[PDB]
Amino acid sequence: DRELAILATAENLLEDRPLADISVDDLAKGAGISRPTFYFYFPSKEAVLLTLLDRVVNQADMALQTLAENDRENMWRTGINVFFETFGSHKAVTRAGQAARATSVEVAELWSTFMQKWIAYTAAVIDAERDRGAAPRTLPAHELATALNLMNERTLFASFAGEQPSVPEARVLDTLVHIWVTSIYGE
């Protein structure tokens, strides 16, 4: 498709510079189409990013659903690793998509929809752990799930962007898993 060519070009260019510094002409050129032909597939470069982010969050979400059809530390590590690997494989899209949350209501709403879904799935697993006697009844599961998921969002994305400060990318999985296991199973 010309559609897939535009998406691949946008992902490539986002590795070099932000969306602000990519023109519809750059996207058309890389995709081997004219400018007006671009506007047939997407109303704006912003819509291209929204589509790229939607594919990445759906890939993470489908990978977590795959896990869910089947030791406590290794379970949480495997689950966190879906997001580490999936977002970690699409750092430029992840970075540009997180920035676009501030300027695009559609990007804000996509990110918010999936965060609510992943928080609800986390809380359901914590509740099942509590029901089976593996985890103590401490905080409300949904509030614990919210903070742990927000920690992961901020910590993954700071590490991938090499922000100062950040956990080094080679330490971020062990770091998050420790905090998830001690806070879910502790006291």
Contact footprint for a second copy (CB under 8 A): 99, 102, 112, 115-116, 119, 138-140, 143-144, 146-151, 153-155, 158, 163-168, 171-172, 174-176, 178-179, 181-183, 185-187
Q: Is 83 exposed, middle or buried (CB count within 10 Å of its CB: 0-12, 13-18, 19+)?
A: buried
3-state secondary structure of 97: helix
Q: Judge contact between 180 and 80, C-beta under 8 A.
A: yes
Contact predicate 129/110, CB 8 Å: no
Q: State which of residues 125, 172, 181, 184 lies at the interface with ligand GFK (CB under 6 A).
A: 125
Least distance to ligand GFK from the beta carbon of 145, Å? 8
In the complex with a second copy, the residue whose CB is nearer, 53 or 176, is: 176
Planar angle of CA 78, 88, 17, nearest 5 degrees: 170
Q: Is 149 in the site for ligand GFK (CB under 6 A)?
A: yes
Query: Could you list the residues that contact ligand GFK (CB under 6 A)?
Result: 64, 67-68, 70, 75, 78-80, 83, 118, 121-122, 125, 149, 152-153, 156
